[PDB]
Design a protein around this nucleic acid. Structure first.
Lengths: 30, 822, 198, 56
RNA sequence: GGCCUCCGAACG
């Protein structure tokens, strides 16, 4: 479980989706 | 229910508003009373407009559905869990069916909260993982998305999944208290490599699309019916050009025949809710009956664009589709699709063995339909296998490979297919001895374990040359033109090989070349001299090449010889024959030249043509013992080949010694009969080998096609004609002869006697047959009639009694009208 | 070939990935160079109007997309200027989608800048596609865009004098025809400036 | 590793409103490495933790 | 600024 996001059980569902920050979150932050 | 019931009261203290009304729940807040920024419309929000003010008054974000959440998770729990052994096709049909039913109306309701959308990952995960459990594999590399989804006959289960997605989970409990942000959204699909699947949610229509749809469309049909009421009628295709499919109240629905004319005023919601609570179950109807409403769920770009995102022809190339489609190259257009659902099964509910065997073939069709599961090498527990007397690489499911593949490979005859290609090259090379001045050419001894060993090399045949083969670098067969050195030593001999695996990833160049340099580098079995030619072929997609030295008179020779020979081989005739036989789905061409009419006239000329009826090979005596049980004891049969022109009849008797110890005696009678006929063909010198073979049964057609591969000149065809060799059999000859037969033996019979002297073979043939069906019905009254005079006698060495031609005609008329009487 | 495959993947991910605001991570994850940015915006609008109905996800993807970088909003200004050159060349059903996306981005007003000046063609010269689409985008954008604050705030934004058909006072056909077309289209008191000026 | 002692979720409406604040100070986005080496920074489930090796 | 659960053998 990373900072702010994570799945306790990585084997719980499918595969751990290597998420980042989304080229749109920077657009909403700026 | 007091505390069990829920309610919400909006006021000046409560900034927003909400409610539980209908399904899921609702929420709304006014744009004027919202202090922070303005109304943000992205996905889960909604536009609340005021018709009086002509503007957007508020913004309504509603909820997800918890009761429908647990209802869908439990619906898949009892759906998949309650579903036992059966075809995964219909399993995915109900899976994606009901899943699309819950996905019929979702939009911002299900898209709002990510918790409900996260259950779909477990849905499809337990779906494809459930089919993998049915395949006893559960390997992620053995089931890529290619086999996960594909419409119609493309080979996929047709499952529509919205897996590839990342839920907007941000700042964990900190945002659970904040409820504002977007960052680092979930993960993604289950297994996706540089690709993204489609989504039914993005391909569906949001509630706003129904708002504006039924709004502007309701105004179009509104004013249209208005002006049609004031002016003349003018009801025509203009309404079809008005896009009647737009909006839930589709204009095409109200303009139908049985809809407007039939049915009634009161809607179908009565039977919807009531019947949904009634009968033996409910259904996924969130709106109304198909007659009262429609034009909502339409595949269109879902299946179309789904196949567009799919590899298409390239996807079939990645799968085993194009592999088995090699010889039937025209099958790529999906002509015959599939068939055989009902087959010979009686009704639906039957014995558990008939149901398991009924679901065997489709599970084996989808199993063996995908080669790379048991073919493409994977990691972890993937191990090497030798298959049966041919070869294998990757391991996998036992029933698919052994069961389905062994049935496709049929018997050990595949070794005779490899030796049939090697001997096809040896016999295919004739003028090469004169052109290349071959001193001595002799085919080496073919060992059964030589072609069965994939690691070592294989010896095909031996040849020679004036000096030797002229060449420099023994590159592949597809290599371009290069400088060929002489390098003349003694002689050279061609080799051959085959590969039945490597569906997805296969290279004839690297594997054939590097294989010849490998087995040739070390010492295992080297048929030719150090300078020679080695041929390597792959059974996948009908591949052929040569890794040996390419001579100016060799490379084109074996090149074109592999163009026509690899174009249609006898081993390739068994490849498409047994291939399409195991597929049992798409057949774009019938058989030929099956005997119909002209075969009777052509049966008497100066060619071949054999009639084979094995029906009496299997004969038993059924007698009920007084314990109340039946005892079935087989008795001797016989195998039949008849010559229409000469009346020559071939007798091969089958004995309970070879009927002993085995089972499935009808199919065993088929294979045994075909094998014995093949042996007799081999025994009657090539002049006495037939040009054609006529049989009465498809169960005769296939086994003969299996055993006869070594003589391509022989043509196999079926016939609907009726030939009671049984009647004759008992009668006289096999009553006494099969009744007395102590062992298999073989005798030449003439059934026309002196007819060939007196009459033509055609008259003897038609008279023969008519008098045959006679010899059944009147066998009874042929034993009555055929001695019309007290002095009528049959000579010991003939079949028939001696009669005058007029009496023969009387027999013709009486027995023909007999056949008409039945 | 590059635009055909780029449009095949852009349309494949467009028809997929519900809530396209999250799909912007994949669209930007494609890492298309600046040469594919303009073609990705034009083909992005082609996929926006290629749907059977107006989709707000296209307006959100254009708002965040164009709102990401400077060349993005610039590609929305130039791409909008090229869209103004369509007129009768645009489809009838797709005109409502262009009015819904252009009205959604116009409601935010962030990326478009001179789009208000490029509109408002002459009095008697029109293709009826920009007039009908200008009436649909004017009614919907008037409802959801805060028409009293949009027209009142737009009067001091110098967008009216920069537009040809929106110019009151001198030209009699622009202000008079703008009052008849605006009042006939449902603008109401919004044409009182051109009515009194004419 | 695992969720360890935490089962699924334990919280309260009054406890979250008292501990956290709707309007509070915002400087850095709660760096996990800062709370890692500082057991006082993260007060959630400080049970059986061997940590706090200061610098070098 | 990165985090990639997956992973099959018999019997029945």
């Amino acid at each position: 479980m990373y900072n702010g996001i994570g799945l306790p059980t990585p084997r719980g569902s499918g595969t751990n989706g290597y998420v980042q920050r989304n080229l749109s979150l920077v657009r909403g932050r700026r | 229910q007091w505390e069990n019931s829920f309610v919400s009261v909006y006021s000046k203290d409560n900034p927003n508003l909400l409610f539980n009304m209908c399904g899921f729940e609702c929420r709304i807040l006014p744009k004027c009373r919202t202090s922070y920024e303005e109304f943000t419309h992205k996905d889960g929000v909604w536009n609340l407009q005021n018709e009086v003010t002509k503007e957007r008054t508020a913004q309504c974000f509603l909820r997800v559905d918890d009761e429908s959440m647990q209802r869908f998770h439990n619906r898949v729990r009892q759906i998949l869990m309650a579903s036992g052994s059966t075809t995964f096709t219909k399993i995915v049909n109900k899976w994606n069916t009901a899943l699309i039913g819950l996905m019929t109306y979702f939009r911002e309701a299900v898209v709002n909260t990510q918790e409900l959308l996260d259950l779909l990952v477990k849905c499809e995960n337990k779906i494809q993982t459930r089919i993998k459990i049915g395949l006893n594999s559960k390997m992620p590399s053995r089931f890529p998305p290619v086999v996960f989804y594909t419409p119609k006959e493309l080979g996929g289960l047709g499952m529509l999944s919205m897996g590839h997605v990342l839920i907007p989970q941000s700042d964990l409990r900190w945002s659970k208290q904040t409820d504002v942000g977007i960052t680092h959204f979930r993960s993604g699909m289950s297994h996706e490599e540089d690709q993204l699947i489609p989504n039914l949610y993005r391909y569906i229509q949001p509630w706003e699309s129904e708002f504006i749809d039924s709004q502007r469309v309701w105004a179009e049909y509104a004013l249209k019916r208005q002006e049609a009421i004031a002016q003349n009628r003018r009801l025509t295709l203009e309404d079809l050009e008005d896009s009647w499919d737009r909006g839930i109240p589709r204009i095409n629905t109200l303009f139908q025949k049985d809809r407007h004319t039939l049915a009634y005023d009161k809607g179908w919601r009565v039977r919807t809710d009531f019947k949904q609570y009634q009968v033996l179950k409910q259904n996924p109807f969130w709106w109304t009956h198909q007659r009262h409403d429609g034009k909502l769920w339409n595949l269109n770009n879902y299946r179309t664009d789904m196949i567009q995102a799919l590899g298409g022809v390239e996807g079939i190339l990645e799968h085993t589709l194009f592999k088995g489609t090699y010889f039937p190259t025209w099958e790529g257009l999906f002509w015959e699709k599939a068939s055989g659902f009902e087959e010979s099964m009686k009704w639906k509910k039957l014995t558990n063995a008939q149901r398991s065997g009924l679901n065997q073939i489709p599970n084996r069709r989808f199993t063996l339909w995908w080669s790379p599961t048991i073919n493409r090498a994977n990691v972890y527990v993937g191990f090497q296998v030798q298959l049966d007397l041919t070869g294998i690489f990757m391991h996998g499911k036992i029933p698919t490979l052994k069961i389905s593949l062994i049935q496709i490979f049929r018997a050990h005859l595949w070794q005779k297919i490899h030796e049939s290609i090697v001997m096809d090259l040896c016999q295919v090379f004739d003028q090469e001895l004169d052109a290349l001045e071959i001193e001595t050419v002799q085919k080496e001894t073919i060992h059964p374990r030589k072609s069965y060993k994939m690691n070592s090399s294989c010896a095909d045949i031996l040849l020679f040359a004036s000096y030797k083969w002229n060449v420099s670098r023994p590159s592949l067969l597809a290599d371009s033109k290069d400088v060929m050195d002489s390098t003349t030593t003694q002689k050279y001999w061609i080799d051959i090989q085959l590969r039945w695996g490597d569906y997805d990833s296969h290279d004839i160049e690297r594997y054939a070349r590097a294989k010849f340099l490998d087995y040739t580098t070390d010492n295992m079995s080297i048929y030719p001299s150090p300078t020679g030619v080695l041929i390597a072929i792959d059974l996948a997609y009908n591949l052929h090449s040569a890794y040996g030295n390419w001579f100016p008179g060799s490379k084109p020779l074996i090149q074109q010889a592999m163009a026509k020979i690899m174009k249609a081989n006898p081993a390739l005739y068994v490849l498409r024959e047994r291939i399409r036989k195991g597929l049992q789905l798409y057949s774009s061409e019938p058989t030929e030249p099956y005997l119909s009419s002209q075969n009777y006239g052509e049966l008497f000329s100066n060619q071949i043509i054999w009639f084979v009826d094995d029906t009496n090979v299997y004969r038993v005596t059924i007698h009920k013992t007084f314990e109340g049980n039946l005892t079935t004891k087989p008795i001797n049969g016989a195998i039949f080949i008849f010559n229409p022109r000469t009346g020559q009849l071939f007798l091969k008797i089958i004995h309970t010694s070879v009927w002993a110890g085995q089972k499935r005696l009808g199919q065993l009678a088929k294979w045994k009969t075909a094998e014995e006929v093949a042996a007799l063909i081999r025994s009657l010198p090539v002049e006495e080998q037939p040009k054609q073979i006529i049989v009465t049964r498809k169960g005769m057609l296939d086994p003969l096609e299996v055993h006869l591969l070594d003589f391509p000149n022989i043509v196999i065809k079926g016939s609907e004609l009726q030939l009671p060799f049984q009647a004759c059999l008992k009668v006289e000859k096999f009553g006494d002869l099969i009744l007395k037969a102590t062992e298999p033996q073989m005798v030449l019979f003439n059934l026309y006697d002196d007819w060939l002297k007196t009459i033509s073979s055609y008259t003897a043939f038609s008279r023969l047959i008519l008098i045959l069906r006679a010899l059944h019905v009147n066998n009874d009254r042929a034993k009555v009639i055929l001695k019309p005079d007290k002095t009528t006698i049959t000579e010991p060495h003939h079949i028939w009694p001696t009669l005058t031609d007029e009496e023969w005609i009387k027999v013709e008329v009486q027995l023909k009208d007999l056949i008409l009487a039945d | 070939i590059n635009l055909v495959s780029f449009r095949r993947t852009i349309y494949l991910a467009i028809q997929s990935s519900l809530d396209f605001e999250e799909c912007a991570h994949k669209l930007l994850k494609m890492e298309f160079p600046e040469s594919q940015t303009k073609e990705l915006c034009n083909m992005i609008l082609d996929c926006c109007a290629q749907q059977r109905t107006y989709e707000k996800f296209f307006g959100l993807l254009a708002g965040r997309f164009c709102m990401l970088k400077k060349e993005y909003m610039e590609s929305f200004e130039g791409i909008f200027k090229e869209q103004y050159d369509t007129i009768h060349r645009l489809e009838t059903n797709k005109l409502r989608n262009v009015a819904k996306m252009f009205a959604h981005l116009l409601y935010t007003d962030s990326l478009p800048w001179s789009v208000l000046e490029c509109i408002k063609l002459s009095e008697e010269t029109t293709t009826s596609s920009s007039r009908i689409f200008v009436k649909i985008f004017f009614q919907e954008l008037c409802e959801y865009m805060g028409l009293p604050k949009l027209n009142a705030r737009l009067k001091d934004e110098t967008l009216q004098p920069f537009f040809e058909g929106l110019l009151p006072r001198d030209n009699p056909r622009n202000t008079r025809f703008a009052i008849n077309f605006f009042t006939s289209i449902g603008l109401g008191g919004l044409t009182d400036e051109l009515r009194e000026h004419l | 590793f695992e969720p360890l002692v935490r089962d699924i979720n334990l919280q309260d409406e009054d406890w979250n409103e008292f501990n956290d604040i709707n309007k509070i100070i915002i400087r850095q986005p709660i760096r996990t490495e800062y709370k890692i080496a500082f057991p006082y920074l993260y007060n959630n489930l400080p049970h059986h933790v061997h940590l706090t090796w200061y610098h070098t």
